[PDB]
Amino acid sequence: PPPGLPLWMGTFADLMSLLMCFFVLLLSFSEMDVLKFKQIAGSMKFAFGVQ
Amino acid sequence: PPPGLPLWMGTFADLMSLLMCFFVLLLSFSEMDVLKFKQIAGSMKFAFGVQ
Amino acid sequence: LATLLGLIGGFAFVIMAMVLGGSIGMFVDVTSILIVVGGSIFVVLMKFTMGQFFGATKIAGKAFMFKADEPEDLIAKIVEMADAARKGGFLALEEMEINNTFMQKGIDLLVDGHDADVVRAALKKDIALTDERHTQGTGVFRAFGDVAPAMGMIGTLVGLVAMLSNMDDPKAIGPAMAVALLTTLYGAILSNMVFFPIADKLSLRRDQETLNRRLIMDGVLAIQDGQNPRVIDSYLKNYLNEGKRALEID
Amino acid sequence: MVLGGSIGMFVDVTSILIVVGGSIFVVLMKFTMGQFFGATKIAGKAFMFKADEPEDLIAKIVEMADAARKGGFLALEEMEINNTFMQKGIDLLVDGHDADVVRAALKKDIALTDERHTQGTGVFRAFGDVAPAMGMIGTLVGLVAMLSNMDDPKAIGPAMAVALLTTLYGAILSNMVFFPIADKLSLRRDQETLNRRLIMDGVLAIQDGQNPRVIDSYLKNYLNEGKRALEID
Amino acid sequence: MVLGGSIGMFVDVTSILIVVGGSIFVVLMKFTMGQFFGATKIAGKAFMFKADEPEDLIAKIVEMADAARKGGFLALEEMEINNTFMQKGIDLLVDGHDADVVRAALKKDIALTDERHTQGTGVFRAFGDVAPAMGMIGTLVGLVAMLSNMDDPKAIGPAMAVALLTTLYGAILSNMVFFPIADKLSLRRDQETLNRRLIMDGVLAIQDGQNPRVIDSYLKNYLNEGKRALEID
Amino acid sequence: MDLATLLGLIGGFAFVIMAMVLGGSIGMFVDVTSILIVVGGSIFVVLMKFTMGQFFGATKIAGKAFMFKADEPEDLIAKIVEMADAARKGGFLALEEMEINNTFMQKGIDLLVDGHDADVVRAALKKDIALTDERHTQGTGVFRAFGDVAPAMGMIGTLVGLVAMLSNMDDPKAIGPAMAVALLTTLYGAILSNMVFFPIADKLSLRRDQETLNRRLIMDGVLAIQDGQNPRVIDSYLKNYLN
Amino acid sequence: MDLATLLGLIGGFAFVIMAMVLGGSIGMFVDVTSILIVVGGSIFVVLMKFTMGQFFGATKIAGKAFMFKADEPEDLIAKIVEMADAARKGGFLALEEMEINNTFMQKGIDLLVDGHDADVVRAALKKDIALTDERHTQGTGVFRAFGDVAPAMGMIGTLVGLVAMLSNMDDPKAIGPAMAVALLTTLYGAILSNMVFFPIADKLSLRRDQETLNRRLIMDGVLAIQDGQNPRVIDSYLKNYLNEGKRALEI
Ligand code: NA
Ligand code: NA
């Protein structure tokens, strides 16, 4: 059988998902700047083949 | 042989990092709203049995 | 099965508990489950053919819908035809009533007239056939479980690039990310609560069928030898204290 | 916990349902409900009853050998017996059975007890394997519920509570309950193997009419090896 | 990458370079150029072709069995054999050599084919192992670039696109190309080894001198071992 | 260990510490409760698989692998052919005048000279070799268990700290420091797992291999000594067994 | 300098240019604390398992593998058969009148011409081969250990960076650069593990195979010269041994 992935990778994913949960929390009580969200939205559109 | 983590676990840590840093990007241009913070704090102490 | 009624109850309870926060629509999407299952099917089909995947599915169906014959009714029946043979030879075996295909085949080979070696070889060949078949079905479902989270994450990644290519309202990004992550959730759920459990129940049924078939083979060999039901009782009940039923006896 | 705040802040029906119910479903898909209850029974006896000291077993076997040598093969039925395996050995020796049959019976009991402990260890290691998977599933469920309801704090709270507490419950059950129970079952299995080997050798020596002076020396050959080697120089 | 709506979103030269070139470098450090090219050839042969069906192999084996039974070791020259291994076996049979040496040569050829397939599987498993690692490297590079230039929107887009597409390409290549190719190579290894063992047994049975019908039964015994046993009902 | 190896160890440790210092305050990464959580939980979990005697034995065997180096095989062959020559020009009593280099070798030659058969001495030496091998395997198991549970306890502590922080927020500017303190448990678990416990387990496995090789060589040498073979034959056989 | 090394160098150069273009600059992929954490912790852990002498030997053997290309077995076989002709028509003393570019071959030739018997010459050559194999295995082990520890150390350093970022987090809308610095440590660990240490260990394994084959061919040729076999016979023997030693995928 394949050896699998090392335990630090599991720790890293648990930490990443935990920080995801807490950054979703931080963005829950926050107000995104709509003006600054369309520059980023246009840049992602430009860099993904649509624009 | 001692087992390990599934081979997709690296891709999972990858995806969690990507989503986490996307939320960091969203929080970069987002201003905090204190009223929403109070509501979310109350909901947190209610969902955690802290009333 | 009682574990299957518990399965249904647990499914219902866990879905109801999961969907209380919002609507059932948040955790339900046909496109996501279709992506996960289709990608897993494609990956598994490169390493199993249509006939071998359908075989694994039909053996899973037999292992779930049906229930293996208990290894105590087997002892009762075996000692019954043992008494029949002791009273009237092998000529009394055919008129008996048999609900087990393997035992029926064994006694139908015995009546014709064959020595111990050939009947033992045939029974061992059948046992190995059913063991390999269940093992390969377990392999099919292990492959499905191994690839399902990867396919779910591929679907999530595709959904995320589709979301980053279509970004208008700051308030739709959250629901879009939730729908994209639904594929990863489905991959994890299918891996851990469907495919791997199906592989485990196939392995469990493999062990049960191997035990039942060894029981039947020993019973038929003893009947051909003409042994009395006494020693047969001990030499057949001693097999009931192995595996997990061994952990069941107190 | 109690120092952090309270035990009351880790209670959630959804998180318990996800972790515990999913783990139970997965485990019952490979174990019988009655068999799982039997594994629970052996875990409870391993936790509520200490294994007999090998030195005490050796000493009492030597005493039994002294009594047998002084009063024949029927002198061991008037004084108390510690464990059930030794009691069965005594009541098989009182029947005048030959060495081979009692040896086979004792070797069957040894294999049976080893299998029971190994299967209980397997049950609890299956539980400990599935609990963190269910915790990760709960994290995914909570993340989906949070992202779907970022405008509603009344949904944000419980969703994050589910996501966090599923992982916390999975980790605690896996690493402080289920895997420790499996490890204690393995330890109790090793103690059982040692005790059963000692008792079987003692019964074998009693049947042979060997003087207890050789018996104690022969029995001492087991305790000076094995898992305890880290204590032996 | 079609569910997004088209293909033009899921294309970046940068992400492709990071993933493919990094994987190629790592694999070429693990394996020689000859090993890599042989693995490519064997994968192409396994995908574009089909192993000879065992049924036809047993039919042909009993054909030369009956042919040798009617004409001893001289009739085998006059019929056509489409299989290279079977042709080599019948040639080593008709060139007047004993069973031991031809069996050793056929075993050596079987082991050579087995090792070749195993090494090709290893090459593609190395590719499938490195591809997600390259995806993670690309994610880390893109995320450092994105988080560093947060005040530059036109730099945020390409950096996150590289980070995301590297992971998507690594996942797709690992789980839908490289690992599937390795699994297909293992499947073809099992098929080729079974077919070559069938041919070896047929050649040895013709060498000995055996009834075609017992030969046929012995060869049919081989048709129920593995995934064909899964398929057979 | 060697002075150069020790200086390299201190240099790596100092590089890590100086990196932590250069990244801000060092009291940000220090928490007594977090280290108590990780260490106490790891001890609690490990003590349910190993007794206190076993844990202390593993600690001692790991400690004596850091302050004592495995004897080089070449020195062992040279010395064994040395007392082989001593026995040939002298006798078995000549072995007594040879001073102490390895305890296993010393006890083997003592059991050989006190008048015992070749087979019983071989059995005793084999038993000792197996005991030492299993001792090293048990120490590796103890430290592997510690390295396996330390990240688990660290994540448990992080989750508990974050649940406690979310239970009473009351202040948004205090969110970040609370998660930093909660993450300290994960940091300690990772450091102990990957820098202390797993390295010691790997080192003990390496020393297990080295000790088995050295003790097999010593056993073969002393068995040849009791055989009275030609020391050149002994040397050639041992050198062949090296490769 | 094989193509794999060349491809790796050009790939790393293009990767650096790519990282600089994506991020505008290159000075943000460079963090002294992150480098210190990854390198120092990796050295600490590897030196917990290997000695400094072993680490230095591994470094030297890696440098020799990446700077000197192994001799091709065909060229070595040609040299041995040419020496076979020279010794057949010039005696053993004729072996000191032509240059030999292989140090192992020169050592075998000196042992052959110094009157040593076949047994001692074979023993010394086998000892040299075993020492070379052990050096390569030790280097592979050291770099495998470095590859194993670098991403664990990178995740430790990322934890350190995350704690630093969160401790200084008020109104998280400036945590971007700090989070990037935290991620730099895992980036270093990933690049060092997957692209440097594991590749060096794999190339050392390949070089072990090449050097074992070359040295065994040289030993066989030297021993054949010791017994004075016919050059054609030993040429056929060496060619057969080289062919049967070829990996299946290359056939
Ligand atoms: Na990845
Ligand atoms: Na969770």
Numbering used by the authors:
A (entry chain F), B (entry chain G): 11 to 61
C (entry chain A): 3 to 252
D (entry chain E), E (entry chain B): 20 to 252
F (entry chain D): 1 to 243
G (entry chain C): 1 to 251
Sentences from the paper on this structure:
Single-particle analysis yielded an overall resolution of VaPomAB in Lauryl Maltose Neopentyl Glycol (LMNG) detergent of ~2.5 Å, with the cryo-EM map of sufficient quality to build an atomic model for most of the protein complex. The local resolution corresponding to the inner transmembrane domain approaches 2 Å, with clear density for non-protein molecules, allowing us to model water molecules and ions, as well as residue side chains isomers. The plugged motifs from two PomB chains are fully resolved in our PomAB structure, where they are positioned on the top of the periplasmic side of the stator unit, consistent with a plugged autoinhibited state. The PomAB structure shows that the D24 of two PomB chains sit in different environments; D24 of Pom B chain 1 interacts with PomA, which we refer to as an engaged state; while D24 of PomB chain 2 points towards the cytoplasmic domain and breaks the interaction with PomA, which we refer to as a disengaged state. Examination of the high-resolution density map in the vicinities of these two aspartates reveals nonresidue densities. In site 2, near the disengaged PomB D24, which is more flexible as indicated by the slightly blurred EM density of its acidic side chain, a globular density is well coordinated by oxygen atoms exclusively contributed by PomA TM3 and TM4: side chain hydroxyl groups of T158, T185 and T186, and exposed backbone carbonyl groups of G154 and A182, with an average distance between the density center and associated oxygen of 2.33 Å. To further validate the model, we performed two explicit solvent all-atom MD simulations (1 µs for each) and observed that the Na+ ion in site 1 was very stable, but the other Na+ ion in site 2 rapidly moved to an intermediate site formed by the side chain of D24, T158, and T186 and subsequentially to a location symmetric to site 1, and finally released to the cytoplasmic space.
